[PDB]
Amino acid sequence: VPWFPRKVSELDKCHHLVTKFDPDLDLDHPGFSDQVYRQRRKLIAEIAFQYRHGDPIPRVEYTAEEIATWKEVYTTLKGLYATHACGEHLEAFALLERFSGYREDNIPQLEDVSRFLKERTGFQLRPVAGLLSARDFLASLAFRVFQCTQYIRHASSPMHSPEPDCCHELLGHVPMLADRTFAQFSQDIGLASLGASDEEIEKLSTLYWFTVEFGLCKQNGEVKAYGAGLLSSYGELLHCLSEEPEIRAFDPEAAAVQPYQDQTYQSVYFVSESFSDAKDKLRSYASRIQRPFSVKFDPYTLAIDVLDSPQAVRRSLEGVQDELDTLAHALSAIG
Amino acid sequence: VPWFPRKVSELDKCHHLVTKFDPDLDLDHPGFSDQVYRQRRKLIAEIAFQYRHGDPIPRVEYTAEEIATWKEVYTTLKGLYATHACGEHLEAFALLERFSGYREDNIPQLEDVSRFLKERTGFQLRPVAGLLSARDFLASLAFRVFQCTQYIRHASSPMHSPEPDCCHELLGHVPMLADRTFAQFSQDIGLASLGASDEEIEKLSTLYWFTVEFGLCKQNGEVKAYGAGLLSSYGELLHCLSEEPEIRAFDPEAAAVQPYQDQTYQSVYFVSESFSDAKDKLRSYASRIQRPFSVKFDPYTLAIDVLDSPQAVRRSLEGVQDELDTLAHALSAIG
Amino acid sequence: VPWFPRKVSELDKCHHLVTKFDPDLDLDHPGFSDQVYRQRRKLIAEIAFQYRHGDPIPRVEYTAEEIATWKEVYTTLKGLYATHACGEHLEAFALLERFSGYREDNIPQLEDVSRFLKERTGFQLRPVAGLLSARDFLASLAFRVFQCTQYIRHASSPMHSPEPDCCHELLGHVPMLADRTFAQFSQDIGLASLGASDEEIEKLSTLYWFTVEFGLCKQNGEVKAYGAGLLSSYGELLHCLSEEPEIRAFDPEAAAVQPYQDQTYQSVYFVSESFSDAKDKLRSYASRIQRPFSVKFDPYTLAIDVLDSPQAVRRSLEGVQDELDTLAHALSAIG
Amino acid sequence: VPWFPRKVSELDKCHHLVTKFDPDLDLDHPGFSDQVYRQRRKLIAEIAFQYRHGDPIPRVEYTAEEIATWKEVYTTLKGLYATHACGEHLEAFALLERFSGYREDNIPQLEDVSRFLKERTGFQLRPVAGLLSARDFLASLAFRVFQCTQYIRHASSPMHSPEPDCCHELLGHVPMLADRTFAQFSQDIGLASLGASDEEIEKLSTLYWFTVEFGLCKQNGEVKAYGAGLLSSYGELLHCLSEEPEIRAFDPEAAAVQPYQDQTYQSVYFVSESFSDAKDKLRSYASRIQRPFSVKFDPYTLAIDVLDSPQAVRRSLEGVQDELDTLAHALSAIG
Amino acid sequence: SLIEDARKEREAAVAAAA
Amino acid sequence: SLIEDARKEREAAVAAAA
Amino acid sequence: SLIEDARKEREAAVAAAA
Amino acid sequence: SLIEDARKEREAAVAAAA
Ligand SMILES: NCCc1ccc(O)c(O)c1
Ligand SMILES: NCCc1ccc(O)c(O)c1
Ligand SMILES: NCCc1ccc(O)c(O)c1
Ligand SMILES: NCCc1ccc(O)c(O)c1
Ligand SMILES: [Fe+3]
Ligand SMILES: [Fe+3]
Ligand SMILES: [Fe+3]
Ligand SMILES: [Fe+3]
């Protein structure tokens, strides 16, 4: 069984120690030839690499070009997010822009959103650089923390980015997982990932790409999109609800085998009319996923306690019937 | 119904806004005539008053006198905590000193312990100055956060302090509420305090004084003390297990009427052989405490949702049978 | 709100008092012109009408004709139930015939099956005559008791009966609701029927006709039938899995509006691949069914306690977390 | 592990087959020299021995002497049960006499009370003769059925009986275990008895003698008696609340070692102020009782399913969160 | 014919009401 | 006398074992 | 002195009410 | 490209095993 973390503390020390001394090259990628980008990536990596849990996010400045590009994408998205987009995005985005300060003139930092989520939703942000493995990111995603980056795309290609950047997640990921239901949804994916074999690691990752990154929802009669990648690109949004790509009902097992493509638009999509349907299907998927154990999340200490003995089930119990005891007061004092 | 907070955010903004522009006088108290103490209290108040939630604790320096006094009390307590003290203190104190750094040479800060608790126990620390009301402190204590101060006693009287200080709680409170059981115990007291009438506010506060501040435990056959005030004074510890003071079994209703005394040793004490007995008795006490509502704690966002409708009970439910659903995996995958 | 029973006692006294002095005419129906049938119906009605709860079923004799007809249908059904039929029927029918004594030579009584069900499944049988209303039968079906009759079809028409008879239910109903899952399924239908308005009474009754009387199941890859009426007629079984009738997926709301036909084969059918799917869909159907109350079943006394106050929810609770307490022993003593 | 039953069916067939061909001698006991008593015991044994589960209790006649004696004890007890007796006895006895027909002129049968209990409480009665072992009776008492006898004491000694008789239980046992709480209490004792070792068998049996047969309750300020033996003898009732016998608080472990006496009044008694206290203490007693398994009771079929695998815990679960699902309707439709 | 048993309910029910 | 009914258990039980 | 902190509550509370 | 991040896992994983 591959080693997996149990507390947020070792999510920091070892996954940054196993990933020490590793810069991003991306030379052959579009752009990334300007020296200023390399200097920025150095500063971006330095803040991310030596960051420790519990510490506030070190605020990073933003010069003229990034905000000027941030003008372009942010202005284009609000005029188009009013259509084609999921309903939960709308009141969230309005809630984000009025409180957190999602505006064209001011580029948002990471501390303000990080404070904003755990105030309501419970997700923390975390800077990172280099090549994110599949296992390190799911371990973070398991603990109700979303791994993130603070640098943005290249000014040469503001319409699309070779790799997900800051604006990709603060506009595609962050608005989505601020939801009560999807956060519980997103957490379930991470929960099944604890100690899963490499073959299984691919499966839910494809599901994560096929549900969180590109997912369709059916509410108010019409179909809408809630994918992170869907709500992070301009041309994708036009293609997403267009009649060219093939759209089918979501299926955990089916989405775990179907392949992908890169640098091109996606022609395959999965739709879930309700996030309740979304949870309880990969819920059944995790049921058939064999493991020598299971995993329980403790929100009182933000840790993971392993489950290979019926005894380990015990120190979860008095908490479980605790509410069913505390439900007495609420359902006694009432009336 | 008096106003009560629901999230950690308003625990900060209003309870520091209702308590703005209020310095501590304490002129007639023993000591507090040196100007350096007044200057220190200014610095202590400034750090405490303008502190905001989510921010790390601003580290405060400590000159020769406070640590030199910190030498005296810390050295005297370990040689005596080996006896007369609760068992849960012992492995906690050893755990605290080796990790957090509870030593005579180094005075502990607040960030390191604050990190240490929520790593395992889930309590945050919070600086404060001035006169703490009964309602503001219970609102903090409800949210699984312990209000605290960073200044220490006067060097003139290191044996006893007129008011609880930094060393009083980091040695009397902090070692105690690092426990799984007592933290759940301490939280229950805070839960009942939400919106309680002023008469009720006195009751559990006396219980807090009569259980957390001065409490006796019966384990391993012999009787031991776990009170915060009990394990914060040298002369008290000798008097606590001495045969002079009257010791009786703990009773929530009985402890809510019996009075106290100041500047003198306590002759009355309550003993609870098990913290499980300790929880479920004031649990019954809260049952007879009338309220126009009840209160539920949400650890996913560290907030409070009010309970005056059966509907409000609903958005607590799918979480409640969530584990009883997730208990399936742990109790299916096993065996 | 129409009056509805709460205990098995008043299921007997009033529903037989509201239905006193009412013989069945059925003169225009096929057959029913022989005097022996009228004399038999008198004896059948007498046993049924004056029967009281708790008493054993009075054994009724069976002369040459009924068993000779019972030879014909029973022999024809086993040679055909081996095909086209639900899997749960097969081991149940073999279990019934070996223990209860389902054979061609011996016609089964009612006491032996009544003993057999509550030994494993928990359903009691009850004789009845006359015109069964919709409300009286659902009240019985709610209490995990199945209303039944002991007389059989006319010898002139053994292939089909104008009204359900003894052999119809002991071969169509009894084999089905001996299942753990379907009994819980069947009970759920009855539970929603408590005090429901006349419009709602029609709905679940149509569902009862469209699920219990004629229902399709998809197991082992192929589709099978579990309807009571489906597994009670010879020609129906040939028509049921034939390609002429239209077969569609089961839907509670859709099945509640779609009409029926009489004296002719059914062309519309609903299929449920799993009885778990079958329960939790009309479960959602009952959610949108408005009622000024709800209903809970108590198996310790076989009674119904009304639910219009949160207080009434209380005397259900200590039972609910009783197992979650008794689950401790099973999940403690183990390992 | 000694063999133990799992369904009510084998409670009948084997425990009457292991106890075949065994008459009661009781020659040296007071009385029992009249031939009419021997002839009555033959008739009493015949009805009891060949009785099968599910069948109604065969009504037994009662000639002049038994009812004439039944006049004496019944008249003496009501004039004294108004004092010294438990509160739950009072409204139960009035409820019994008005409905079941507890009167001096008419001696009650067994079918009427048997119907009356499972109408509300859920206990069935069962005739028996000969020497009842410890294991056979607890197996019955486990299944929420009370083993009983229909013959009464000797007319020579109506004040006291050498062995418990019909009037002893219909006046000492039956009035007590008609309670919601005590029935759940009585059931808990039986539950722990499943497959327990012979040493353990003695323990709870002594508890059964020390709680059900002779138990004291503290309600309405004063102390009252609810023991079956306590409320079955005239002289005992005077001695029970008299100041001569020693009375102490109830303790499961303490009551399991303390001995008894025969043919003389008891000087030791245990008092439980609340039956809730009574349940949850032997609840903890069963926790420390080691077993290679545990036992769960299923009221839907009145059977016992063994618990030696976590899998066996599973087929108990969907029932457990079934109410927590059905609690939704009651707590949704309300308000 | 149980649907007809539902169809028998209401005219007798509503004519009693009417 | 049910305790004596427990006291009757074991000599018959252990002598059967013995 | 937290009980005195309860004892400080009410005269200020009731005199504000008064 | 996270699927490719799954596609990068195993040759490095199995060649380490190999
Ligand atoms: N009471 C409605 C008529 C009825 C009764 C019993 C049945 O099995 C059936 O299919 C239909
Ligand atoms: N079988 C043990 C003897 C016994 C039987 C019934 C009783 O009520 C009682 O007190 C004692
Ligand atoms: N706010 C009430 C005063 C107080 C504050 C902190 C303590 O630890 C204590 O014992 C008493
Ligand atoms: N670590 C896998 C690469 C990745 C990282 C973040 C994303 O938002 C995303 O879509 C893909
Ligand atoms: Fe992304
Ligand atoms: Fe203190
Ligand atoms: Fe039918
Ligand atoms: Fe008795």
Coordinates of N, CA and C in Angstrom, one line a residue, chain A residues 53 55-56 115 118-122 144 184 187 283 286-287 293-294 296-297 299-301 307-310 313 320 322-330 333-334, chain B residues 53 55-56 115 118-122 144 184 187 283 286-287 293-294 296-297 299-301 307-310 313 320 322-330 333-334:
Chain A
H53 N 2.0 25.2 6.3 CA 0.6 25.2 6.7 C 0.4 26.1 7.9
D55 N 0.4 29.3 8.0 CA 0.8 30.6 7.7 C -0.1 31.3 6.7
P56 N -0.3 32.6 6.8 CA -1.1 33.3 5.8 C -0.4 33.3 4.5
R115 N -9.6 33.1 3.1 CA -10.5 33.4 4.3 C -11.9 33.3 3.9
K118 N -13.3 29.2 3.8 CA -13.5 28.5 5.1 C -14.4 29.3 6.1
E119 N -14.6 30.6 5.7 CA -15.7 31.3 6.4 C -17.1 30.6 6.1
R120 N -17.3 30.2 4.9 CA -18.6 29.5 4.5 C -18.4 28.1 4.1
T121 N -17.5 27.8 3.1 CA -17.4 26.5 2.5 C -16.4 25.6 3.2
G122 N -15.2 26.1 3.6 CA -14.2 25.3 4.3 C -13.0 24.8 3.5
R144 N -10.1 18.5 1.9 CA -10.9 19.7 1.8 C -10.0 21.0 1.7
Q184 N -18.9 19.0 -0.8 CA -19.1 17.7 -0.3 C -18.9 16.7 -1.4
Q187 N -15.1 16.6 -2.0 CA -14.4 15.9 -0.9 C -14.6 14.4 -1.1
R283 N -20.1 7.5 -5.2 CA -20.3 6.8 -4.0 C -20.5 5.3 -4.2
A286 N -17.0 4.1 -5.5 CA -16.1 3.8 -4.4 C -16.4 2.5 -3.7
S287 N -17.7 2.1 -3.7 CA -18.1 0.8 -3.1 C -17.4 -0.3 -3.7
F293 N -8.7 -1.2 3.4 CA -9.1 -0.4 4.5 C -10.2 0.6 3.9
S294 N -10.6 1.5 4.8 CA -11.4 2.7 4.3 C -10.9 3.9 5.1
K296 N -11.9 7.8 7.0 CA -12.9 8.7 7.6 C -12.2 10.1 7.8
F297 N -13.0 11.1 7.6 CA -12.5 12.5 7.7 C -13.0 13.1 9.0
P299 N -13.5 16.5 10.9 CA -13.4 18.0 10.7 C -13.0 18.8 12.0
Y300 N -13.1 18.1 13.2 CA -12.7 18.8 14.4 C -11.2 19.1 14.5
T301 N -10.4 18.2 13.8 CA -9.0 18.5 13.8 C -8.4 18.5 12.4
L307 N -9.1 3.1 8.8 CA -10.2 2.2 9.1 C -9.9 0.8 8.6
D308 N -9.0 0.1 9.4 CA -8.8 -1.3 9.1 C -9.3 -2.2 10.2
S309 N -9.7 -1.7 11.3 CA -10.2 -2.5 12.4 C -11.6 -2.0 12.7
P310 N -12.5 -2.9 13.2 CA -13.8 -2.4 13.8 C -13.6 -1.5 15.0
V313 N -13.6 2.0 13.9 CA -14.9 2.4 13.7 C -15.5 3.0 15.0
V320 N -20.9 10.0 16.1 CA -22.0 9.8 15.2 C -23.3 9.9 15.9
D322 N -23.6 11.4 18.6 CA -23.6 12.6 19.4 C -24.7 13.6 18.9
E323 N -24.7 13.8 17.5 CA -25.8 14.6 17.0 C -27.1 14.0 17.2
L324 N -27.3 12.7 17.0 CA -28.5 12.0 17.2 C -28.9 12.1 18.7
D325 N -27.9 12.4 19.6 CA -28.3 12.9 20.9 C -28.5 14.4 20.9
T326 N -27.7 15.2 20.3 CA -27.9 16.6 20.3 C -29.1 17.0 19.4
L327 N -29.5 16.2 18.5 CA -30.8 16.4 17.8 C -32.0 16.4 18.8
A328 N -31.8 15.7 20.0 CA -32.9 15.7 21.0 C -33.2 17.2 21.4
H329 N -32.2 17.9 21.8 CA -32.4 19.3 22.3 C -33.2 20.1 21.2
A330 N -32.7 20.1 20.0 CA -33.3 20.9 18.9 C -34.7 20.4 18.6
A333 N -36.6 21.2 22.5 CA -36.9 22.6 22.8 C -37.9 23.2 21.9
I334 N -37.9 22.7 20.6 CA -38.8 23.2 19.7 C -40.2 22.8 20.0
Chain B
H53 N -9.4 37.8 13.0 CA -9.4 36.3 12.8 C -8.7 35.9 11.6
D55 N -5.6 35.8 11.0 CA -4.3 36.3 11.0 C -3.5 35.5 12.0
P56 N -2.2 35.2 11.8 CA -1.3 34.6 12.8 C -1.1 35.5 14.0
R115 N -1.2 26.6 16.7 CA -1.0 25.6 15.7 C -1.1 24.2 16.2
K118 N -5.1 22.9 17.1 CA -6.0 22.6 16.0 C -5.3 21.5 15.1
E119 N -4.0 21.3 15.3 CA -3.4 20.1 14.7 C -4.0 18.8 15.2
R120 N -4.3 18.8 16.5 CA -4.9 17.6 17.2 C -6.2 17.9 17.8
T121 N -6.3 18.9 18.6 CA -7.5 19.2 19.4 C -8.6 20.1 18.8
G122 N -8.1 21.1 18.1 CA -9.1 22.0 17.4 C -9.4 23.3 18.1
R144 N -15.4 26.6 20.1 CA -14.1 25.8 20.2 C -12.9 26.7 20.0
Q184 N -14.5 18.3 24.0 CA -15.9 18.0 23.7 C -16.7 18.4 24.9
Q187 N -16.7 22.3 25.0 CA -17.6 22.8 23.9 C -19.0 22.7 24.3
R283 N -25.2 18.0 30.2 CA -26.1 17.6 29.1 C -27.5 17.5 29.5
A286 N -28.6 21.1 30.5 CA -29.0 21.9 29.3 C -30.4 21.5 28.8
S287 N -30.8 20.2 29.1 CA -32.1 19.8 28.8 C -33.2 20.6 29.5
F293 N -35.1 28.2 21.4 CA -34.4 27.6 20.2 C -33.4 26.6 20.8
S294 N -32.6 26.1 19.9 CA -31.4 25.3 20.2 C -30.3 25.7 19.2
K296 N -26.7 24.3 17.0 CA -25.9 23.2 16.4 C -24.6 23.8 15.9
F297 N -23.5 23.1 16.1 CA -22.2 23.5 15.6 C -21.8 22.7 14.4
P299 N -18.7 22.0 12.1 CA -17.2 22.0 12.0 C -16.6 22.2 10.6
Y300 N -17.4 22.0 9.6 CA -17.0 22.1 8.2 C -16.7 23.6 7.9
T301 N -17.4 24.5 8.5 CA -17.2 26.0 8.3 C -17.0 26.7 9.6
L307 N -31.6 26.9 15.5 CA -32.6 25.8 15.4 C -33.9 26.2 16.1
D308 N -34.7 26.9 15.4 CA -36.0 27.2 15.8 C -37.1 26.6 14.9
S309 N -36.8 26.0 13.8 CA -37.7 25.4 12.9 C -37.3 23.9 12.7
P310 N -38.2 23.0 12.5 CA -37.9 21.6 12.1 C -37.1 21.6 10.8
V313 N -33.5 21.8 11.3 CA -33.0 20.4 11.7 C -32.7 19.7 10.4
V320 N -25.8 14.0 9.1 CA -25.9 13.1 10.2 C -25.9 11.6 9.7
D322 N -24.9 10.9 6.9 CA -23.8 10.8 5.9 C -22.8 9.8 6.4
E323 N -22.4 9.9 7.7 CA -21.4 8.9 8.3 C -22.1 7.6 8.3
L324 N -23.3 7.5 8.8 CA -24.1 6.2 8.8 C -24.2 5.6 7.4
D325 N -24.0 6.5 6.4 CA -23.8 5.9 5.1 C -22.3 5.6 4.9
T326 N -21.4 6.5 5.3 CA -19.9 6.3 5.1 C -19.4 5.2 6.0
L327 N -20.2 5.0 7.1 CA -19.8 3.8 8.0 C -20.0 2.5 7.2
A328 N -20.8 2.5 6.1 CA -20.9 1.3 5.3 C -19.6 0.9 4.7
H329 N -18.9 1.8 4.1 CA -17.6 1.5 3.4 C -16.6 0.9 4.5
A330 N -16.5 1.6 5.6 CA -15.5 1.1 6.6 C -16.0 -0.3 7.1
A333 N -15.8 -2.7 3.6 CA -14.5 -3.1 3.0 C -13.7 -3.9 4.1
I334 N -14.0 -3.8 5.3 CA -13.3 -4.6 6.4 C -13.8 -6.0 6.3

